Each structure stands twice: as structure tokens, then as C-alpha cells.
Amino acid sequence: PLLQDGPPPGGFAPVRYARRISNTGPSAMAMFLAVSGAFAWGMYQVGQGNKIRRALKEEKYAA
Amino acid sequence: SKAAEFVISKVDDLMNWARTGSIWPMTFGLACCAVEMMHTGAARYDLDRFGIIFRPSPRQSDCMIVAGTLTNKMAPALRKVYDQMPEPRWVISMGSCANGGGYYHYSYSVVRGCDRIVPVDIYVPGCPPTAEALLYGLLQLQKKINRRKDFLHWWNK
Amino acid sequence: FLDKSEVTDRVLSVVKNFQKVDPSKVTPKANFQNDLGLDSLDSVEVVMALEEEFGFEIPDNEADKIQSIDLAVDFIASHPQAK
Amino acid sequence: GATLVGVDKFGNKYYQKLGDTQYGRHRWVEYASKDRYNASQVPAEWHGWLHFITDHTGDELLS
Amino acid sequence: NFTLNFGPQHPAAHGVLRLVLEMNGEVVERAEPHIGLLHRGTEKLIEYKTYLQALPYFDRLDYVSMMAQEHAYSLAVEKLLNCEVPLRAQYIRVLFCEITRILNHLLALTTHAMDVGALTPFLWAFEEREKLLEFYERVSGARMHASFIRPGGVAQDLPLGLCRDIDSFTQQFASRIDELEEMLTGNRIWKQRLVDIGTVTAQQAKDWGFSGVMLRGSGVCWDLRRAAPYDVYDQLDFDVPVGTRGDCYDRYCIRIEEMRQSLRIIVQCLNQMPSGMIKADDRKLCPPSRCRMKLSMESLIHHFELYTEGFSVPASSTYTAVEAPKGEFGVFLVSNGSNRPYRCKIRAPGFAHSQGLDFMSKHHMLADVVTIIGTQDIVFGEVDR
Amino acid sequence: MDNQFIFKYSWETLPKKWVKKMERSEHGNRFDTNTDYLFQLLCFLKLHTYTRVQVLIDICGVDYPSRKRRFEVVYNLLSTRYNSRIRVQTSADEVTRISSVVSLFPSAGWWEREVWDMFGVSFINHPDLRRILTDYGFEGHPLRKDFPLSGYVQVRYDDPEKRVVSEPIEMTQEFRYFDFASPWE
Amino acid sequence: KEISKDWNTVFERSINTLFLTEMVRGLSLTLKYFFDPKVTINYPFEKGPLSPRFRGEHALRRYPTGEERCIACKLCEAVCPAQAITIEAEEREDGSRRTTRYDIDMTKCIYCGFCQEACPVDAIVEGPNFEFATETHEELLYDKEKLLENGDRWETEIAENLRSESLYR
Amino acid sequence: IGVPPNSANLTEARRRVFDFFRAACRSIPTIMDIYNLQDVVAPSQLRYAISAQIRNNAHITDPKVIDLLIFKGMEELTDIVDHAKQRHHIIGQYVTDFLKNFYTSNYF
Amino acid sequence: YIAVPAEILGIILPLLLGVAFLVLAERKVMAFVQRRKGPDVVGSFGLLQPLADGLKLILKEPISPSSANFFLFRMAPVATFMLSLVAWAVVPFDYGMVLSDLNIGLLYLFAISSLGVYGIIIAGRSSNSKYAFLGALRSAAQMVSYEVSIGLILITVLICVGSCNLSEIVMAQKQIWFGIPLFPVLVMFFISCLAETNRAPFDLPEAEAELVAGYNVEYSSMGFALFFLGEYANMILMSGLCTLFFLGGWLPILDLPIFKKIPGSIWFSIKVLFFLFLYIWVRAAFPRYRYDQLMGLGWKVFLPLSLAWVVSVSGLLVTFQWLP
């Protein structure tokens, strides 16, 4: 009917098929450092909290 | 006994609601109709919305969906699996091959309908039926379950 | 081994159920396919019955060697498994 | 409700929402009845519009 | 050793699969599949129906690649009839063959993942698969069993708005493939459930007739649309992926790459599609237009004589083979010279793949059998004709 | 290699007594050999350097109920290295046994079993030759021209014995055969 | 000998295989789709898209005057691959060639459209209805009155579908 | 193992007949205790049934026909040995007139 | 002393309904991850769906021949269910929101968890099948194997707090959760709880047990459902254990004295439901894990590593005199 379906003038837009990689998230030693520093600081905080709890328990016993 | 009749009516309505809101069909798809019935359970025409979840075993399944051609070698297995099912035990015959012959209907090794092996309650025709067609068939089955005054029949008998 | 009496009884009693034999024809020496007028299928059937009443079997090479009562019952009486 | 498009002789009313680039929630039905509604009440004129077969509303299809 | 049997009813084993296998307690020693549960009897039925009435049997053989079998049957009929096909028909046939390839690869990958245990990619792949099933539902009636490809050209012309929608889909299909691949290739469980499973050597695959992905997985660069290009494939440029060591994982990577190559080919066909007629002007195997059968006497006569009697293929016998998504799908027609085929044997690729399960599942564990079943993409419509 | 090159070389290289009938065309190179030389011809085509036919596509079968050798088994072959396709076919009979080729191509076992299932052509020294497609207890070979399309037996469920049973066929509507064949053809 | 023996890269690989970087990256992808809009449609109120070429319910059209289009030409019965259509005809006292029994076994039917495209008068069509779901088998044996009822019911839409795609084929 | 090639003479055909009958007998107890039937049928009468079935085709002369019949016999026997045949199929399968035909139907 | 049974029922009944709604949450969350809706038709948002499921299960014929001694098959669900409940008698919800106040209450939890192995074993054995029993035995071996990793991680936690009492463990986390320093230990404990309930990628033992058999055994209608209820109760329990030990049991997460209106009873519940959501997320984000590599993983990447974590925590605390 002289109105066949087809691409528009100039063709269609170019497409990608080459598996783009986002590469999201922390990389290399970032996670290791963030975990080791957290572990050390948390252990220091735990020691301080245990000292506070020991003081509380010893004052309870002194009562 | 008119005073209790309300109680029997409410009990029957509750039982039918319980049996309709939770149907666990058992997938017996064995031909190209299984692909359409699999699209029905997919993201678009969600069956899980209507409380319909497929079961891998017949010992814990409400109804059975026969989707695909039923050959002579498979009919004994179909009957055996249908036998190991609980009391309600509804059967839906999805697709043209399952609900009477099919495109073949003239073969040494085709059973002309799954209704010659198991009693079928709802016939869903199409080759293959659309996911909307299967949903409409399941809704028709739900409507059929509503017409069950099983407690009233026990009372009257 | 086995005594001749029991083996002779067991080979001359089971032979009476072949829908053609006669009591006056069965004897320790009455050839199957000649004296009894037995068929080859009936002959393998008789040697089959000889190996059906007990768990032993006669191998393929020993099947058609002797289709007569005498040496067959001698074999029966020389079978260690039989009792 | 972005837009209400026509009504039916059975009483079920027809709505329409226009998306931007992705399909979903374009046009649906509000059935007049409630006794399980049989899932099949749309007439022939409105059946094509509902299934995106034709762009005609259905009231226009009657004329 | 005990010999238990399969036959699960959930679609893990694709249904209608009976597997009697002997194990050594934990390790399987020999698996003997029992096919025939889906032997409808198509081969006997084809002989009783006209060359046109027999076309929809080919939709029902491999029901994930419906237009791939129709392609083979149409090519066989054309080769027997010596009928030329216009360029537009060839281009649209290639486009829909590539769409079938995409559909079949998606379904195979996600049923294999469902067998392994991954559930999410299945639903994503089906919400993708609907967008091509509706393309099928647009050019012809049915979504799955579309008798669109006729022996002459195609059934009827493409709708006006189909090309724009296909291009719009192909714009994002690559990103969708990447999203699906993100959860499987990099995942460590996927590697350990596939690496060193079902290894087949190239010589052994050749011996067992493993044409298809199972052949290219073993390092053989054998593609039927490169070795024997049938429709317009020389014009289209695409790469043939080849595995390094074929064991349930290079096959998966090859299927990913073939999906991407099918996307590339679809884009090329969309860009390069010409305008013109879709059915051959021979008019012995093609029906006249509905406006011509009601105006012209000869056109009505031809319509009447081909919609009842059909075209009569001259007496000969040919074997044609096309690169179906499963593998080498071959149709062997023997023509009596009348309007009905004398014999139509169908070479299903799944037959040899299911035959080769016995050696592939040698000295493996039980959990390494469902992955073998999934990795070869067997459907029992074609296996049991 | 070129189709005519296979024609010329194979016809010249092959022993003359093996090939009874041979054909060259665009449809495909055909070698119609005797029923007893089939194994040797296949072995030669599998191992020869120029003609390295390594994969067997399928084993077909055609029933001609008008000749002394009623059946005709067709061996479709493919040479992956040289990109050629050769076809070897022989003639069979209801009672004549034809040598198997499972030793050469192990994939041919299922095709030979299905040929026996459909046409009833036995194969010599074939390991585990039995019906593969038709059901258990099937009588007759369906793909013969004699076998009726609807078959001889039906399947149904009988209530007196809780099992699925078989009866002689009773069609609700007979298969209407439409005779469209016309003269001037 | 596949080797990755380098001081820096061994640390980089031994961390990815120890802190589940691949698992975390494949895990955060699902959470992206957790908050995304869904793709499902409530079926009873919203229907999925269709096409003017859809193959559904069989219908027997009739002329706007009121005379049925079927002229018992029996092309549909001859072309039907499934052999589902049975036709009986006789000449009415008006002399017109018409059908008396035109029944389609919708359980044998394969919905291929061969019957629809074989009519020289567009007598039979496949309407857009796909919601049969009958509870009885013999209700699926349409018998030339169900066909005419379907034709009357869907005429206002079958005519639109036919006139929309009449430019094709 | 594999299928035997053929039989040139009738002596080999008779030998194969005897071998098939013997094998069918050595397989008679396993089919007795695999279908769970002990008192319904004694093993003796199955021997007579097999003998009658074999003697039915006594008029065959072609050795090839004999060979193919024997092959079908082994196929049926092997099918019965496996738990594949339907239940009690074997027992059902292996167990003037003019006026009688006239009163029923025209086709006798 | 007659007040106890009221507390017992108040602990039991909400647990059962929470198990039902946790099944509903599983279905709904897996639906949403896969771009779906899940059960929506029944009720308002699917909230009545578990009720319909229960009434449907009750209104069915019970297949109960049991083909056996009639006793051991009906006691396995009872044993597993009573164990999975009695494990809840020591959880310190907020402060006095605890039923029993065991001065150990942690070795008690370890013992109760370890005793929850006989139920599935005798279920498999009583169920006369040649593969169901074997699969149950493999599942039992898996739970037994991951019990040692669970115990070593419990020792790691117990070193820091210094006392076995569960309430004191949360009391000791005023400064920090124990999850910040022991984040690898938290991941290990989550994975071990995930693999010890067959509710994970660590699932294949039972998955193949139904694939090759179809559960063609004496399958009671809802007597079997007690296994499922006990497994989901164990899910909830081991979800709450992680927020007792590594997260603050009831303490505010990151809070200034401004959001003090809310009580500590919901600070616990929010973390519990977060861990349950993580359970569902992990299930619908990863493929299943083979039993061949299941045992090897559970024995060769968790026991040595958890032992090393025990050693490192003990050595670091001793060196700087940071003990309780």
C-alpha cells in the first residue's frame, strides 16, 4: 500500500551491546582498612565500657 | 430449625471463602501449554495475587491443571497422580490438547481428552490459551467452588 | 548321592501330567520322542520339569545329550545339590 | 484518578491514566456489581478499547 | 546398587521427563532416560495433510523457538519447489528467527538457574519475554504458535508501528542482559555449581552428534548460518562465540554472547530492511490478495484451488537444516509428487543431546544431574515427535 | 569442499562393488549401496583423509509398499572439517536384518531403535534394541503405510478395576479424508 | 600453569574472595528492583494489551441487511488442519445456498486462522474474545447458533477490526 | 548382547526357539514374585500357555520369519520382566453359530 | 505462683501468628523483589491470606496411615516444636520482658539448639523411605556441623561481656553494639544461623529429597506442618539472637536524648524484622549450594576462621587489660 513499515530517514539510533560494567562499591584495601580500624576502635571502646561496668559493679558491692 | 439456618449459611460461606482464597494448584504441564501457564505464574499476570501457588507434590495440592497433550504412555501416570490427592480434588483442563483430543486427536498414542482419565470440572480452551484465559478459567473455578453448600447438604441428609 | 528309589519315583510321577502319557507306557526305560511319541518342545518341557522340581539346572550343552529316563535319572542321582 | 473516560449501560465505569515511557496502569474498569462480577461484563464496543485493540473510546465506536 | 527413578511434576525437569538412573549410593553410574511420554505422532500425521495444513505441526515441535522450525519447513518446501523469495520477506524471517533465538536462550538460561536454585532471574527474564511475545502477537494472531512464516514468503505484512517498538525494546535489552548477567557470572556459587561439570570433548561431541551450543562449547567453530548461510546472513555481520573447555559454564557464556549477537543481528535487520512485496509472485504457493480474489476470476480460481488442494511439490527428496536455537534442526521431506508429503522426518536437536546424557552424567553426583539437564536445554516436544 | 569434487573423488576412490546406485544434484550427493556393504562404506567415509565424515546427522526410513524391498533406511552424514553433506541409503525388508553402525557413531543407537519402533527393521548386533517411542505393549509399527492413522487400540479409565485399560478403537467422529487430487497433473 | 602470583594482586584477590564482594554486588541489585514499580496488572479490572489480528472466539458474521454471510462453500472445512469444522448444506426454497448444520468442535480447534482467511465472503471470523472457560465439555461444541450469537454480540467490534486491517492482505 | 545376525537353516531356527523357551522359563519365577501373585495362578500353567503360543506358529517355513518372531518374543519377555507392563496384563493376555451371529448383527 | 501459664500463653500464641505472618512476609517480599505483588486479593494487602491457608489446611482429609509403629512419627513434630518454643523462654526482650532469668542462659541456648537434631532424624527414620531418611540425615549432619561454628562465635561474644546471662550481654553494649568491631564475626554468625536451619543457599539436602521422591511417604495433612512451624520459629529465634549479641538488644541504635518517646521493646523488634528481611533477601538473591561443597565449606572456612577470631579477641583483650 506504498506505506510499508520501515526505519525512519537516517536510520535508527545506535545501540550498545558490549556489556558495560558499572564497577560500583569500594575497591582494593578500602574495605580492609575500614574493617581493621573499626575493629581496633571498637575494641578500645569495649575495654572502656568494661571498665565502666566494673566500676558500677564494685560500687554496688561496696554498698 | 430456621434459627440455626443462619449459622449453617455463615459456616458454609466461611468454608467456601477459605477454599477459594487459597488454591494450591499442582502443575502437570507437559507440552507447550505449560509455557503459557508458566507465563501466567510470571510477573505480569500474577497468580500469587489470587492466593494461587503451585505445588511440587500432589499430596498437598488443592486442584490439578492438565496442560498439554496426554499420550497413552502418560495416562496411567496421570491417573495415579490424581488418585493421591485430597477430598476437594478439582481438575482444570488447560489447552486444546488436554480438553479433548487436540490438534492431533487421531493418533495411535494420544488420549482424546484428559476427561477420559480423570473427571474434569473446568475446560479452558485455546491452543495455547492466553494467560488471561487461564486466569478467567481459574476465576470460573473459584465461582464454581462458591456454589458448594457442603455443610447444608450434610445437615439435610 | 541319591538312592535310585526316590529319584525314580520323582521322575516317573511328574511324567504323568503331560495330557498324553499313559500309565502302562511309563517305565524306567521308555524313550521320550520314540516310545512316548513326545514332541521336541514336549521333550524340552520334560527335561525342564526335571529341573523345575528342584533349584538345580541342566546347562545348554547338556540339554539334548540324553532325552531318555535312564541316564537322566542317573544324572539326577549323581547331583550333589539334590536330596 | 487522572481521567474518567465514558461509562457503560451496565454501570461499570472506565478510567484512564497516561504514563511517560513505561507501560502500566493505563486503563481499567470499575465494575458496577459485586457478586464476583463474572470477570466478563465489558460489552463488544468497550472490549476493544480496554485491550488496546483500538484507540476509539467505545461510545464513539457505537456511532 | 539401587536404581531409583525421576519424574518430578514441578517444571524443574521441564516436565514429562522420566529418568531411570543407577547410582553407587551417592555417585551416579548410568542414567537411562525413558522418552516417548510425549510421542503425539506428528510424523504419521504429516503424511495425511496438505503441505500447508502441516505447517502448524512445526510450531508444536520446539515450543520456545516456534518460528525457527517454520523457517526450516518453509526452506525445505522452497528448495523442493524452486521458489524465489523477496528481500523484505527474507529480512523479516531473519529478524523473527533472531527473536526466537533470544526467547529460547532466555528461557533456557532461567530454567537452568531455577534448577540450580536461583529464582530472581526467572521472573525478570519472563517480564522481558512478554515484550517479544507481544511482538509475535502483533504481526500474527497467537503469541506462541504463530503461523507467520509460510512457504512462499510470510503470512502477511508487518504493522505500521512494529519497527519503532522493536527498536525501543532493543534500546534497553542490552542493559537488561547485563543486569541478568550481574547475578550469575560474577557469583561464586554459580561457578562452583557449573565449573568442571559435564565436560565434553570436541571429538566426543562430534561422535554423539552434539551440533549446536553443545558443539561450540567444545571448541568447534561450527555455525550453520556461517557455514551454510541460507537467508540474508552474508549481509549481516556477527561473531560466533566459541568455548575453551565445554563444561556447563562455557555453554552458559556462549549463550549470553549469542543473545548479544542476536540483538546485534536484529538491529542490523531493522536498519537494512527494504520495501517491496512479501510473498512470491509465483501464485502457485501464495494466495491472492483479498481485494483481488473478489475482483479477478483467475485470482479467485487460484485462491479456491490452493486453499483446498494446495500446491503440488514435484517428486523429489531433500534434507534442509537451519541453525535453531537448540542446535541443528533438520527436516527431511520426501515428495510423492502430489499435494501431500510422502514422508517428513524431523531431526530434532534435542534427541542427540538427551541421548548424550548417559555419558555426561558419568561418575557425577545426583545434584550434578539437574544441571546437566538444564545446560543442554532439552524440550520433549521435539525429542518425542 | 565443492559438491562436485566430493562426487568425482568419492566415486573414483571408493571400491566399485560397494555403490550400486549413486546420484549427483543440487539437493544432495546420494550413494545408494547394498545392504551388506553399508558398514564398510560408512567406515571408509568416516576415516578417509579427504572425506572425513565424523558426525552422523540421523538415520531416516521411507516405506514404499510397492517394491520388493519395501523399506529404505537413509543415513544423513556431515563432514564438519570439509563442510560437505553426504547421504547414504540402502533398501531393507520386513524380515531382512541390516548391520548396525553404532560401533562407528555411538549416537546412532537411538535412531536405530526408533527406526525399529516405527518400521520394524531389525539391526544386527545392536546393543539394547527395543521400542523407544511407542508405549509398552504396543502392537504394530506405526509408520508403515499399513498402520491406520487412528491405530487399533484406545485408552480409557475403567471403574470396576481401578486402573487405566485398553479397548479396540471406537472413534466418535471418523477421520474425514478429503480427496483433493485432480487430473491435469 | 594458571598463575596470579604478584604481591599486590594476591592481596586484591584474597580480599574479594573473603569479604564477599561479588555476593554483595549481586545482592544490592535485587534491592534496586525492590523499590522499583511493579510490572503486574490486576487482571479482572485491567486487561493486557492485544492486537487487531488476535485469534480468539469464532463468530459467524452476517450482512447488515440480516442475511447470513455463510454460503456453504466449505473452504473452511477443507482448509481446517485440525478437522474441527463440520458443515451440512441444502438449498432453501428461496433457492439460496445456505447451511443447516455448521458446528465447530472448539476442543479440536487449534486457533490458527486458516478458516478465517479462507472465506471468500468473510463469513467466519475469530473475534477478540478469549474467555470461554465452560464447565462442561459439550458446551464447547459450538453448533451454528452459538456462532451466530457470538457474531451478533461482537459485530460492532469485529467489523472495526476487519476494516482496520483490510488494507493488509 | 547384540542382535544375532540371522539363521541360514531351520536347525538354527529350532535351536533359537528352544533357547527362547528355556530363557522364558528361567524368567518365570521373577515375574511370579514381582507382580505379587502367588496363589491366583500356579507357575505350571504358564508353561503350557507359552508352549501353546509357540506351537501356534508351527506352519512358518522362512527362517527369517522365525528369527523375527523369536526376537519379538524376547522383546515381550523383557518388557514383562521389568515392572513396566500394567498390573495383571499378563494373566488377562495369557490365560448353530450361524444363528448366534445372525441374532446380533448383520456383519457377523 | 499461678501467674506463669498466662505468661506462657502470651509468649506462645503471638509466636504462632508471627510465624504465619512471617510466611506471608516471605511471599510478599519475594514478590516485590521480582517486580510482583504477591498475595493481594485476599484481605486488604494479603493480610488475611495466612488465615485462609490455615482454614484450608484444616478442611482437608488427613493422610495418616503412618505405615509404622504409630508412635515415633507423631512425636518428632512434638519434640521439634517444643524445643523451638522452649528456646524462647530466655530471651530478654527489653528489661523485665523475659520469662526466665537463667544465670547462664547462653550455654542453655547452645544446648537447646544442639538438641534440635533428633526431631528430623527420627522423622526421616520413622518415614519409611529409602531416600527421605537419607536426606533428613544429611540435613542433620549439616546442622550438627554448623553448630560448632555457632558455639565458637558464642564464645567470641562471651569473652567480651564476661558473663553468660543474656540480659547482661545487652547491658554490656551501652558503649557500642559489639557489631562494629566483630563485623566479620557478625557475618559469620549470620551465615551459620542461615545454614543451620536449611533456610539459605545452604538448602540442597532437603531440596533433592523431594525432587527424586515427591514425598511419596506417609504425609499427614497438617501434622507435617509442625516441622514447618518449628523451622520458621527457629528462623525468628536465630534472627533475634543476632540482634541480642552483635546489635544492641534493645538499646537505641544512633540516638540523642530526643527520640526517647518510643520504648526499648520495639528497638528489638525493628532489628529482628530487619534480620528477617535480610533472610528473605539472601534467599531470593543467591543460587542454591551443593551438599558436596556445603560440608567442605562449613568445615574448612568457618571452624578455623572462627577459632582464629576467638584467639585474636582473647589475645587483644588480655594484652591491654580490657577484660570485664
Ligand SMILES: CCCCCCCCCCCCCCCCCCCC(=O)O[C@H](COC(=O)CCCCCCCCCCCCCC)COP(=O)(O)OCCN
Ligand atoms: C550491617 C548489618 C548487617 C548484618 C548482617 C551481616 C552481613 C551479612 C551479609 C551476608 C551477605 C552474603 C550472604 C551469602 C551467604 C553465603 C555466602 C557464603 C560464601 C562463603 O562462604 O565464602 C567463603 C568466604 O566467606 C567468608 O569468609 C565470610 C567471613 C568473613 C571473613 C572476614 C573477612 C575480613 C577479615 C579481616 C579481619 C580484619 C580484622 C583483623 C584484626 C569462602 O569462599 P570460597 O568457597 O570461594 O573459598 C575457597 C575455599 N574453598
Ligand SMILES: CCCCCCCCCCCC(=O)SCCNC(=O)CCNC(=O)[C@H](O)C(C)(C)COP(=O)(O)O
Ligand atoms: C510370560 C511369558 C513371556 C513371553 C511370552 C511370549 C509368548 C509368545 C511366545 C513367542 C511366540 C512365537 O511365535 S516365537 C517362536 C516361533 N517359532 C516357531 O513357531 C517354530 C515353528 N515350529 C517348529 O519349528 C516345530 O514344528 C516345533 C513346533 C518347534 C517343534 O515341532 P517338531 O520338533 O516336531 O518339528
Ligand code: SF4
Ligand atoms: S492445546 Fe495447542 S499449545 Fe496446548 S498442548 Fe495442545 S497443541 Fe500444544
Ligand code: SF4
Ligand atoms: S468458508 Fe465461510 S462461507 Fe464458506 S462454508 Fe465456511 S463459513 Fe461458510
Ligand code: SF4
Ligand atoms: S482456527 Fe484452524 S483449526 Fe480452528 S476451525 Fe479455523 S481452520 Fe480449523
